Amino acid sequence: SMEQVAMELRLTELTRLLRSVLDQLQDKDPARIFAQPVSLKEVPDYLDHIKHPMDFATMRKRLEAQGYKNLHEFEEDFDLIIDNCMKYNARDTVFYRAAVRLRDQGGVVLRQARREVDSIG
């Protein structure tokens, strides 16, 4: 149906805008602390602590399969990256501090993305 097409075009356009959001969030992580999954070979206990691991590579796979239906879904995954790191790592660590900075800087970006998603539809 043409209706099914039109819905697909909207998903595609949301995917475009989410890719640009994702690029801009990832630039706020020049250290690449959140670029890849935590390795279960190097933190064998990770899954006893963290139930839903997340990282920018995993978000990017989902994005390219058009797996985010709305901005809320995408934000949930971004928040997992931050929130998981702030639980596993202590306050005095380069990891926790990197998550706080990514959260603060990412807030700015997400605030305008929400306006753009509402604005364009």
Domains and CATH numbers, the chain: 1-121 (1.20.920.10)
In the structure encoding, which two tokens stand for residue 91, read together? 């306050």
Beta-carbon contacts of 71 under 8 Å, excluding residues fewer than 6 positions away, are 14, 18, 113, 114, 117
Give just the sign of the alpha carbon dihedral 83, 80, 56, 43. Answer: positive
Q: How was this structure determined?
A: X-ray
CA distances to 13, 17, 62 from 72, in Å: 16, 13, 14
Give the C-alpha separation, 1 to 8, whole Å.
Answer: 11
- DSSP 8-state code for residue 22: H
Give the C-alpha separation, 17 to 31, whole Å.
Answer: 24
The separation between CA 99 and the C-alpha centre of its own chain, rounded to angstroms, equals 12
Which of 53, 58, 57 has the alpha carbon at shortest distance from 83? 53
| Residue 61 CB coordination number (10 Å) | 9
The separation between CA 61 and the C-alpha centre of its own chain, rounded to angstroms, equals 11
Beta-carbon contacts of 16 under 8 Å, excluding residues fewer than 6 positions away, are none
Q: Is 53:47 a contact under the CB 8 Å cutoff?
A: yes
For 80-119, letters b (16+ CB in 10 Å) and e give: bbbebbbebeeeeeeebebbeebbeebeebbeebeeebee
Q: What is the resolution of this structure in A?
A: 1.9
Give the C-alpha separation, 71 to 58, whole Å.
Answer: 16
| Residue 2 CB coordination number (10 Å) | 6
The separation between CA 13 and the C-alpha centre of its own chain, rounded to angstroms, equals 18
Helix axes 56-64, 71-88, angle to 10 degrees: 160
